[PDB]
């Protein structure tokens with residue numbers, strides 16, 4: 001349970017949408033309803049937690065840092081994914097559809113698999129554990145050379161504490177990427193969302209408490225796009 005509540009982009013502060021009590025104030029973040037998980041990989045809410053858009057954008061150049069903050073976050077097992085999506089034109093006509101989503105950042109499981117397992121709570125072998133406990137942040141570089149334009153950026157945490165019962169927590173925000181890069185990820189780096197994973201994939205629904213499995217976690221979605 002939790003959501004990205006605010007951002008720091010290229011050194012500037014951007015408040016998020018206030019899911020539990022919208023203020024009516026202009027923000028860069030697409031709407032989100034509350035802290036409940038999306039429970040199915042094929043649910044359209046998986047994309048941007050049912051948001052439709054936003055009035056503002058943050059400026060950023062390639063190589064600039066995107067930092068998202070989770071005012072609250074409770075789970076110590078599962079991956080972090082950060083994606084981007086090139087809007088064809090105006091942010092207002094961008095719904096995030098088709099296979100435009102590419103990963104720019106990811107973190108998964110780094111435990112040794114014999115004292116720290118996939119299901120171990122403390123000390124968790126997942127980078128997500130570092131987001132737990134209030135006002136924790138995650139920073140990602142906007143890939144070098146990225147062609148300029150209007151982009152969405154999507155943060156997604158997938159909690160895996162419950163055997164066979166994945167829990168997705170996503171949000172989208174609006175980034176106007178400046179400069180004169182030309183790099184665009186190839187089709188093999190891009191996915192649809194929902195679409196990049198199936199509910200029954202072995203890194204999505206599986207028995208995390210089963211210590212006889214390999215203690216490695218393949219992060220879902222395509223390889224990360226690095227740029228140049």
Ligand SMILES: [Cu+2]
Nearest residue numbers: 001002074075
């Ligand atoms: Cu939760």
